[PDB]
Design a protein around this ligand. Sequence first.
Ligand SMILES: CC(C)(COP(=O)(O)OP(=O)(O)OC[C@H]1O[C@@H](n2cnc3c(N)ncnc32)[C@H](O)[C@@H]1OP(=O)(O)O)[C@@H](O)C(=O)NCCC(=O)NCCS
Ligand SMILES: CC(C)(COP(=O)(O)OP(=O)(O)OC[C@H]1O[C@@H](n2cnc3c(N)ncnc32)[C@H](O)[C@@H]1OP(=O)(O)O)[C@@H](O)C(=O)NCCC(=O)NCCS
Ligand SMILES: CC(C)(COP(=O)(O)OP(=O)(O)OC[C@H]1O[C@@H](n2cnc3c(N)ncnc32)[C@H](O)[C@@H]1OP(=O)(O)O)[C@@H](O)C(=O)NCCC(=O)NCCS
Ligand SMILES: CC(C)(COP(=O)(O)OP(=O)(O)OC[C@H]1O[C@@H](n2cnc3c(N)ncnc32)[C@H](O)[C@@H]1OP(=O)(O)O)[C@@H](O)C(=O)NCCC(=O)NCCS
Ligand code: NA
Ligand code: NA
Lengths: 307, 307
Amino acid sequence: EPSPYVEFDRRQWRALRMSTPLALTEEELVGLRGLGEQIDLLEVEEVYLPLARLIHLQVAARQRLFAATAEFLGEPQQNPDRPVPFIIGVAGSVAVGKSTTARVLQALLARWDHHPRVDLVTTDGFLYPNAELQRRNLMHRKGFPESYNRRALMRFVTSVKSGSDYACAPVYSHLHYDIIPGAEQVVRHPDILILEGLNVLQTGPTLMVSDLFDFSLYVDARIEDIEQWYVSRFLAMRTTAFADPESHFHHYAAFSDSQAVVAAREIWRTINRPNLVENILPTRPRATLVLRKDADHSINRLRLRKL
Amino acid sequence: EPSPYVEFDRRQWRALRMSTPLALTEEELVGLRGLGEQIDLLEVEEVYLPLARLIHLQVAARQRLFAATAEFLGEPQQNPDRPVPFIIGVAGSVAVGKSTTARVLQALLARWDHHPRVDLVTTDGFLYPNAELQRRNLMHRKGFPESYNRRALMRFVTSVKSGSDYACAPVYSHLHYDIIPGAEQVVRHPDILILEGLNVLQTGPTLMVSDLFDFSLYVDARIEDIEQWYVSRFLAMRTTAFADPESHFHHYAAFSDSQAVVAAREIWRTINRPNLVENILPTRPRATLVLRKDADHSINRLRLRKL
Ligand SMILES: CC(C)(COP(=O)(O)OP(=O)(O)OC[C@H]1O[C@@H](n2cnc3c(N)ncnc32)[C@H](O)[C@@H]1OP(=O)(O)O)[C@@H](O)C(=O)NCCC(=O)NCCS
Ligand SMILES: CC(C)(COP(=O)(O)OP(=O)(O)OC[C@H]1O[C@@H](n2cnc3c(N)ncnc32)[C@H](O)[C@@H]1OP(=O)(O)O)[C@@H](O)C(=O)NCCC(=O)NCCS
Ligand SMILES: CC(C)(COP(=O)(O)OP(=O)(O)OC[C@H]1O[C@@H](n2cnc3c(N)ncnc32)[C@H](O)[C@@H]1OP(=O)(O)O)[C@@H](O)C(=O)NCCC(=O)NCCS
Ligand SMILES: CC(C)(COP(=O)(O)OP(=O)(O)OC[C@H]1O[C@@H](n2cnc3c(N)ncnc32)[C@H](O)[C@@H]1OP(=O)(O)O)[C@@H](O)C(=O)NCCC(=O)NCCS
Ligand code: NA
Ligand code: NA
């Protein structure tokens, strides 16, 4: 029976690369790769290149839609030096690799013929300060939809897509586990804005950020595998992030493999998994493209929305 | 500050008519007008004509989007004798006039230069039979999201937009207040499908009909006004629909103005209003165009989504 989607295996998907040129060195790929990710240039070729193609094909097609409405309104026919920003959302669980996926996407798109302005913004910057979370009693729901200033987020994305000359966003520090006082990320009328976050594909009783997406990505994986990557990355951070005396979780550095496994599992069981199950996964059906990852972090299956 | 919308008054909106030709007689408008509606040809000119324009401008632009994806997929470049159906949703409360709006829209679009196949389908046909509603204990929630076979509905709309040669839908009888046994509406690869219903702009944890809309309309009005139209139409039906011995509500025919006002208010208070407040209104922010109606049923304000 009919379906809104169409599924590919890596073999079928890479065929769609065509003449798309690889403009990324191995050393650049490394500075984009997050702890735990196994992505190599081969994957950038067989998975991320066809994706970059499909996107530029549509950046063109999506512009005709705003054209048509501008014509209808009798408005001018706006500046080709400043078209309507193309918004891309990247969603998925904690520790599934969405940040790496989003950084890689930004790199490939910024290296297209013209050299379009491609900004990347994470929703982390819109989380409430820890003091405000404790106030709202949400310290153990950090990551959940309500742990974000969704109003400020929508204001930011709306501002940008509406053609503002510049829009600002707060900044989050993973090291201190909190928002940074006075820090800001300035986005200046980019050609493309990638919004990466747990909650980005979310819908609701009010117009939301996902309603402004022109394209969306959902980095997927078997839940038991994501837990493994989570715990695994947690033990690994004892000697990276947590090893920093300034780290909010510096106490975790001295944990034993066993103590660490227990702690990481409890956090996953009580916080990230519930959120993934109750809020993130339910948004997956709406993603334009779902990148399915095998236990080895490898992307071997994809689900595209044709409707 | 920036906004996803742009609001017009009738004066600003009619200006956008341009050369759009009125192809509707007064007698045809009458056979489209529902009991209680005050729509005249003037409104068809100053409100529905600009709308018909904006739509054909986009039917063209929306086709480029499926083109781009077909190109990406290396697929052919499908039959201009059978393009991807353009889906239009029409939502709003009970008794706000959405059915009239949808019939009028169908008429104007079917009378465009080529003479596109424009089918109209109401979600009434997807309600569960009364016996099944009583089973589910939903007889007093008739109209609510769960009172519909949403699975069958999504199957129907997906089938159609996916290019099926024909798709079938059940049929609902307002007279008998129930689904008609064995009746079916056949939709054969129309150029445009208008889906009219209370719940159509609804979102959820699964891909839904609203996710397949290429354009959407939300017929709006002050809630106290809609109640008035509801009660008002209820008294009026004592001598139209209810006057029919075959009518499920034939007992209502003998009610006095006073008895009738009480009954209609109770039904509105306990069923339609709650649904409007809890489920329909929350979908309004997502409609492409909101037609606001004054107490006299007149459309004097509009809200368009530019983003
Ligand atoms: C704060 C939070 C909502 C952020 O979610 P997120 O950024 O989507 O999580 P991700 O898995 O995508 O991680 C994003 C980046 O932050 C890094 N990171 C996560 N936690 C970190 C930490 N405590 N210190 C340093 N870096 C960290 C990830 O390694 C990743 O780095 P990369 O972009 O180079 O690959 C989430 O991490 C969180 O705290 N969730 C619930 C609370 C929790 O898990 N607490 C345990 C903390 S040890
Ligand atoms: C064990 C078994 C049933 C796999 O699970 P399933 O329940 O079949 O689901 P799938 O294999 O399609 O995929 C499993 C998960 O990966 C996802 N997935 C599969 N293909 C995907 C793709 N192309 N893109 C993204 N995600 C994909 C599924 O959506 C599901 O997601 P979730 O479990 O996180 O909700 C599998 O062994 C099987 O039988 N597959 C049917 C194939 C077949 O030959 N069938 C003949 C029947 S006679
Ligand atoms: C069944 C129901 C869900 C249908 O909703 P709906 O079709 O969106 O309601 P609308 O206000 O759009 O009415 C659509 C059409 O059906 C007509 N209609 C509504 N109820 C009718 C009835 N009992 N008998 C005959 N026609 C009726 C309306 O006049 C309108 O006609 P038109 O298209 O020519 O203008 C809704 O009417 C309902 O029953 N809601 C809750 C129960 C209720 O109100 N019961 C009181 C019945 S008197
Ligand atoms: C009484 C008063 C406040 C009206 O209500 P409001 O609370 O202002 O809301 P609006 O007048 O914009 O509209 C009222 C309703 O109609 C809707 N509406 C207004 N314009 C609309 C449009 N263009 N399209 C669709 N709907 C519209 C609103 O969304 C609202 O919907 P809802 O009540 O069903 O949720 C009005 O008298 C007023 O003060 N308007 C402000 C105009 C003005 O001159 N302000 C100067 C302030 S110093
Ligand atoms: Na910028
Ligand atoms: Na047909």
